[PDB]
């Protein structure tokens, strides 16, 4: 119907795009939704308290602003009772960026 692409990137690659539709995932930072990645934290637009209580992990689809701030268009949470691995996720993202496999995730 309507193809709204939303690739995934690491934290450093956020500084490489500087404005584009992407999807980034992170764990909530406990004290205007704000979540820590990986120690570097990122800030967002969603109402921090508005999300459900049990949810500990989040993934957002939206456009990245200048840096460290991202407007969230799509918000996903789940009660992840297990420690979210990160290095495997970074490997998966890098393989998505690989030339040998780029023809699978995104067009061109």
């Amino acid at each position: 119907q309507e193809q709204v692409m939303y690739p995934r990137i690491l934290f450093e690659q956020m500084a490489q795009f500087r404005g584009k539709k992407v999807t980034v995932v992170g764990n909530v930072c406990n004290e205007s939704l704000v979540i820590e990645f990986g120690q570097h934290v990122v800030i967002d637009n969603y109402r921090r308290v508005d999300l459900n209580n049990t949810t500990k992990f989040v993934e957002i689809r939206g456009v990245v602003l200048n840096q460290n701030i991202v407007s969230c268009e799509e918000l996903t949470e789940f009660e992840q009772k297990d420690p979210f691995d990160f290095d495997t996720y970074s490997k998966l993202i890098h393989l998505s960026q690989s030339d040998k496999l780029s023809s699978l995730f995104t067009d061109q």
């Binding site: 297990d82 420690p83 691995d85 495997t88 490997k91 998966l92 393989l95 690989s98």
Partner: protein, 187 residues
């Protein structure tokens, strides 16, 4: 630490084995389609009674012990362990099957399983057992699958058996796939 292998490698290394070889592997499969056209249990004494003297009127008397025994029910299921590579028909014995039945319904005890199944069947309540077995479809697990290249009625045949049925852990399966794919790209 263990070394895993998919269903394709198992089926391959099984169809290239001579009579008398046994082997075990570990798979990140999932179980499906517990068959039900056979009988779902058998009888056995406590002292490893090979043959149990059958009687009428539900009387029972073992021979490896030679005392009037309360008959014991060991339920044995048959199902299919599959993956993103293949499928294999396996047989599940008393302990594993009881573990499964208990995981799907914690009310029934790991030792009450066979009696529960037999009473439901003989009473005339199979629909409940059918739905209970249906609730296990596509349940992810970690299997220890054993295969043996035996021969029955002078006919060569391969048989697969399941030894350990454990809950799954995505954090390790992910690392397994990652290291395998790294090896695959590196060559």
């Amino acid at each position: 630490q263990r070394i895993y292998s998919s269903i394709e490698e198992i089926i391959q290394q099984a169809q290239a084995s001579e009579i008398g070889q046994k082997k075990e592997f570990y798979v990140y499969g999932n179980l499906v389609s517990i068959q039900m056209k056979n009988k779902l249990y058998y009888y056995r004494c406590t002292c490893q009674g090979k043959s149990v003297l059958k009687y009428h009127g539900d009387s029972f008397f073992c021979e490896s012990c030679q005392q009037f025994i309360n008959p014991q029910v060991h339920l044995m299921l048959r199902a299919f362990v599959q993956d993103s590579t293949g499928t294999i028909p396996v047989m599940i014995f008393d302990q594993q099957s009881s573990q499964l039945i208990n995981q799907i319904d914690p009310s029934i005890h790991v030792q009450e399983a066979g009696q529960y199944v037999k009473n439901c069947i003989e009473n005339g309540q199979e629909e409940i057992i059918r739905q209970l077995f249906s609730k296990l479809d596509f349940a992810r697990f970690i299997f220890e699958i054993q295969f043996e290249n035996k021969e029955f009625n002078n006919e060569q045949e391969i048989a697969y058996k399941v030894l350990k049925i454990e809950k799954e852990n995505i954090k390790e399966e992910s690392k397994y796939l990652l290291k395998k794919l790294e090896h695959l790209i590196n060559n």
